[PDB]
Symmetry: D2
Subunit: 491 residues, 4 copies
């Protein structure tokens, strides 16, 4: 019953060239669906439709209160279809059903948060420094927005972009990862049910290498919003520059998990596993870089390694499963290549580091949860985002050394500090160059607070009021209420 087509200008349409793509379940590498594989001309048509819709004013000039009501209706549909959406996300991405349910709860809350925010702030009145003038700043929708999402949390990442775009009155063109389009197709069906003016929302399906440059480089786009890897992000930004187009980027990280000797030890072990291995480490927020105080380093490594051996791999639909497969053959190959890099530069693969042998896992894209030890900040395995079920462990002596090491990367997305000394944790948090810092927690983020990176982890923010602001533009309207001639130029 799921659509196999793109959604352009109010219609479900095939690709202009009738091409298709088979979508795969990473658990067994079986084809689960076939969808349209769109062309660059389809993408251009969608952008032009979005522009036409924006200029018509049917959505952009709708009242903010009414826009909020429609975004709330989307939220309710997510909750109504929570089970089926979660199952589809697990089928498409491989992560556990429980993880998918949590995603759907978050997605409902994202739409609901932005629904509520829609009508809360139209700008400001400025006390003008010029007598006999009125000065106001009006906040308008930024315009036409292109939105590109990755394969790890397809619908969650889509919601972070769609909700504020709709709440503010923008028109959008979204393109999900070509290998994971299923939930994004479904959410477009649900949005269509709610009802938006023709051209306000558009869904393109296809390879980034075919349609991506149109989405980032088109002159009618006012904002490109992208979540993915650093290489694609940089390429998008350079293409966006051709029209001086606003960019919002979230590009992953090398997130430190800092564990002091006065941490609650079993909590720290639990959260080190959570940070490292949820969704097989395929998370922008993954705690791939463990920094542990020297005094407890050996204790910690032994404890972590013993637990990693017990992680239950399997089908995301099976209730006992703790960790599913990685997303694709290409991604598994990349993780495997990093194991070779790590060994060649002198690190130790303490546990894991290979494909599992078990019969029920042999047809899937599984990779064992892995701990890499005896490494240092100079190493590629420590500096680079592997985005797999892999953590490195480094020791540190002092609070100052923990901070130095944690900040010694090109990234700046998120991190954690574990210590029962809250004063110390707060000092460390203040010094980490990260968009989010958790004190005695991990992977906590939500619609109410902005998420994004310092340094190469991104530009701008998603979620919160700051997330909504990516979709607004300020206009200063200054009215002279007693205009007088300047009489500078001779008469």
């Amino acid at each position: 019953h799921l659509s196999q087509r793109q959604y352009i200008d109010g219609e479900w349409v095939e690709s202009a060239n009738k091409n298709t793509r088979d979508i795969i379940n990473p658990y067994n590498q079986e084809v689960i669906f076939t969808v349209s594989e769109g062309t660059k001309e389809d993408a251009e048509r969608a952008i032009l439709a979005a522009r036409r819709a924006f200029e018509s004013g049917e959505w952009s000039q709708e009242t903010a209160e009414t826009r909020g009501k429609k975004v709330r209706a989307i939220a309710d549909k997510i909750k109504e279809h929570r089970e089926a959406l979660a199952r589809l996300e697990t089928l498409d991405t491989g992560k556990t059903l429980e993880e998918s349910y949590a995603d759907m709860d978050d997605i409902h809350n994202v739409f609901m948060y932005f629904a509520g925010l829609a009508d809360k702030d139209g700008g400001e009145m400025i006390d003008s420094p010029i007598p006999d003038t009125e000065s106001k700043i009006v906040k308008e929708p930024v315009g036409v927005v292109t939105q590109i999402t990755p394969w790890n949390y397809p619908l969650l990442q889509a919601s972070w972009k769609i909700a504020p775009a709709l709440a503010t009155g923008c028109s959008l063109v979204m393109k999900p990862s070509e290998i994971t389009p299923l939930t994004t197709i479904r959410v477009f069906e649900l949005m269509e049910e709610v009802g938006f003016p023709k051209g306000t929302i558009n869904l393109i399906l296809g390879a980034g290498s075919e349609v991506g440059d149109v989405m980032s480089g088109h002159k009618e786009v006012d904002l490109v919003s992208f979540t993915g890897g650093i290489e694609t992000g940089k390429h998008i930004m350079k293409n966006a520059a051709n029209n001086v187009t606003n960019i919002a980027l979230e590009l992953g990280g090398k997130n430190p998990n800092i564990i002091f000797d006065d941490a609650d030890f079993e909590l720290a072990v639990d959260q080190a596993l959570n940070g490292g291995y949820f969704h097989a480490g395929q998370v922008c927020s993954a705690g791939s870089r463990i920094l542990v105080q020297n005094s407890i380093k050996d204790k910690f490594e032994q404890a972590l390694i013993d637990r990693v051996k017990k992680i239950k791999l399997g089908n995301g639909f099976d209730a006992d499963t703790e960790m599913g497969p990685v997303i694709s053959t290409e991604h598994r190959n990349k993780i495997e290549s990093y194991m070779d890099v790590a060994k060649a530069e002198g690190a130790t693969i303490a546990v894991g580091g290979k494909r599992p042998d078990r019969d029920d896992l042999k047809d899937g894209l599984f990779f064992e949860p892995t701990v890499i030890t005896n490494c240092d900040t100079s190493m590629r395995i420590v500096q680079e985002e592997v985005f797999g079920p892999v953590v490195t462990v480094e020791g540190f002596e002092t609070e100052q050394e923990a901070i130095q090491l944690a900040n010694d990367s090109i990234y700046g997305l998120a991190g954690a500090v574990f210590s029962k000394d809250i004063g110390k944790a707060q000092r460390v948090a203040n010094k980490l160059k990260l968009g989010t810092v958790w004190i005695n927690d991990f992977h906590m983020y939500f619609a109410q607070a902005p998420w994004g990176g310092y340094k190469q982890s991104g530009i701008g923010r998603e979620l919160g009021k700051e997330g909504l602001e990516e979709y607004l533009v300020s206009k200063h309207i200054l009215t002279n209420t007693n205009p007088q001639l300047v009489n500078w130029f001779s008469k």
Copy 2:
């Protein structure tokens, strides 16, 4: 008594290669000063010093209240030295001394505004959706910032960047236009008198082609703030992408001056001259594109042309001067080439369009104030920013047509609507895709309100609270106040 050197890491220093540049007065093309012409290694040293200073915390961890007091001290020095600063700006850039005084008054007010804003907003407390958590957003200085300014309003543009950078606790590296460094050198001397930690402020002098790429592309930069032309801006953005560096750009415009038939006619003529010819049209806010309602078009053209013939050209130091020279041989040549373009595509040079013949103007870079008529939106002369003492005049029939034509450019910086029907002016203002819209005024902007462009006129804002926000970064600190093990992974 003015310094001839760069200011790097608390010391006035020559270029690493001892190279120098002769600075010219455009009124007579005479050499007025000789300054150091820095190298890319000087720029890198400055950026590294800025980073070191930032990490030291001496400025970034100073209280916001005290940072505000120092910014206020800069403001007071500008006012103290108003006369000498104005004279330097007029010598270096050619605009009238009266215009330069107005600039110094504005600059005082910019510093004073940001001094007052420094300690007014450290972030937010978030009502977390997770029980037993505290969520806060702390706003920190963005980090190390590079600041590149143009030749038209050197100190004014510098102040828009320096003031918020210092107020927020950033370290900065500034590079003024190579052809107009004098007031920027002077302001650095004044800042040095106020006293800032070593490395907090740095001044590089040199050609954009030699040191610009280091300033935009260095890994230790967190924000590149640029004001200038679109070609350089796009280039900067592409280079900034290499490290996913934030950019704030202001790139000029094709600003419409919309004159309805129910405008106060003599006011509209006065403001059309002001929009077209202040600083010989070398203004990001210049009203180069006049759109006049058809019913008064002939009346308007005759009136404007008659006034343009009376504009007094001369030395900026002479009180009777209404318009000085353009900035350089290269810029005058560009303006001259546009006259040829306009004629070839079928427009009429109604008045001006050449160098003036008068003896006292023959040694200077003068160009006559010009009105181009019988043109249309398809023409290069109408679409492209000439940045000279040149306006085009197009007619429109309806309010809808005025909006369409005004929005028919790649730019989106500022514009005006002249009409005694305020309701109509407000309708038009709401539909113009411009960062600033004046109703019955022109060239009005000030520290209290954000300034910047839609579309190819820029990214981000300068001035106002939004201007300060370019120099901040948000950090979400989430504390779990009752941490519990998740117990997801097997034990």
Copy 3:
């Protein structure tokens, strides 16, 4: 099927003394229902329950997001029960069913607005002027709130108080007008369906003279929020002073309707009728004081008078009815007494000023729509709030005189300016000492914007962000992160 009891500490309960009150329909003066008439001990028990619930934290420490979801659920129930609620409001208060439907649409929007606002703040991070300190302002629910509403728009006024109280996490005790409790009982039934912790919400039914002083004067109350008349409001404020309790008051007005000679004349006549006679003038926002420019005063009076003669009086349930009865015998008597005052001080009753004679209106509390002319600012009829279907008409010569007269009252709630000259309307609006000014409109207010009075019209605001803020209290938490002894006192 409607409850007849109070709702105290999670239970529907009779009065402690078993007393009751008969509720009347003003259209026919028939008894329509009988409810409990509570005692001062019931009110005290409710306040103590509200305090106990607040201290338990079950609502006050619930997440803001979840509080918002519950307030949204109340909003949806209002819409679900729109027809029955509207009919009950018309039965109890006499206004037209069409007016009641509009109320129910507004009430839905009030709850929805506050539902969406619930989780959008939390407080601020302050950049502290003291080194080695953290400064934050946390916004908490104000505490226990008592809420007292009037008989004119019972559920609408209740919604303005309940929505923000619940959104912020307060516990509340509400007492509707003793003569119009029906829709307030119903909304409590609906809130019970949504589910709130025992003691969070409480409904007291009874005479202000019996239970009012407890509600305003109890030591466990943190805010008293009252909407009604000036005499009761002043009494409440004086009683609240005994515990230095916050007060939010809205006390009606003497609202000017300013009509210039360049107003759209038929619009001004239409809106003068709307301002004067909706709900038989029993509206805090009624335009009871018409100020009309002398040049059109005769034209205006004749046009208004001719229309007033055509106003259709009748049963609020009948679709042709334009104006229902007034609320009670006591109120009709008050209005009648004002007619005598007006004549005695020299004014003219130009039309109306008595009970209508028609057979179908004889059993109801009807009073004819009335226009009073030949009056001036010195008169009681002009200065005092009659709160009936009565308007006075005064002339003014100039814009300056209009402002002077409009501001010449003890009140300051709302007003309008009618003029096609928007600049003039804006000048006047800026000078009027009124919480709301309409330019070319009347009776426009909504959840998104604050409503309240200057001068004797009130203290504080309802609706908007400022309305929510009445229900919050600020706490500055300052942590010294490197505490040192002061060593002032000798050792």
Copy 4:
């Protein structure tokens, strides 16, 4: 050289009846100065002048930027005259010169803060839920404000009221405590030097019993701002009610100083002395109610008592003095009466509790620093604000009991928690019903953050943005841009 007169409507004037008052130095009870003792007619004249000035618009319509510049000029004058002002405050109030210097530094910062805030927020643009409307909220000065200050920190408390009143464009009438007018007279002289429109600022000198009711009860007042005791505050609020006038009250407190067994012990002793005895305990922020964990109660009492015996009493001008005299005979008598109350209800005067005998202290209004032990929450000595150099000590067993006891008073101004367990201190801080909570500090407050009380400690806030907001009023201006007749009433 100091003025002896009132300042009314731009002129220094004596009392209407030529009455005067002798001002005393509490160190030696000698007459130090004689000032005018104004009449209620003088107060009325000042209020009418303030109203006339407000309506003139000369200050209320001045640009916010310029108002800020003038407030900054006042700040600079305070710093310029720091020495003389500090000496005058010490002469008039008795506190140490070092304390007075700190006050003057704080006062400079208060004026500077508000100077910087003046032009930062003129209101909001609202996204209206009604099509074809514009909705804006303009923030105006509240109007005419009366300001009444106490004798303990005369100029500091005056600055908290004057600075925001002037920044926002209000007109003000200030009346300092009749017994301590000196620095308030001086600051009026300084303000006059800056220059404000006639009637914008006014100073009344006299007994609260003679002129106070006019200041709180006059119909032309829009806000009464009072800092003092609860009895006077309640009386002011009841009088203000006569015109439904806004009130801002700060009425002192029973501030808890909570010391856990895991506090830094010597820090806690130091801060218990600071909280109890600065300005001889005559501070709204005094830590008069010490709550100490039972486990360390005996240790703490002995350590505190031993230190209290060493406190150096003397002349505020002498550098070795740690504590000066109390303010007046009447106040010393009140403190003495409380010693009798404490003993009669069963408490122990552990140290102090009498006038000192030493020869150099015999002519002054000295009272020994006192510690009261063996008391409980039921006692008047624990519940009531003594406002002298007196602390009570109660024990608590648990964190829960500490919170219960601390919240068991009618007040709610400020308090502290001392514990090295920052998580615990934060839990306690969140549960205390206090406007300010210090974690490991005491007496820390500043212009950047709001100060005020829950419960009987006050209404509203001073300092910070919220403090400025007491001096603003919101006006919703709603413009219908396409007005249509409603056609409800028959034609």
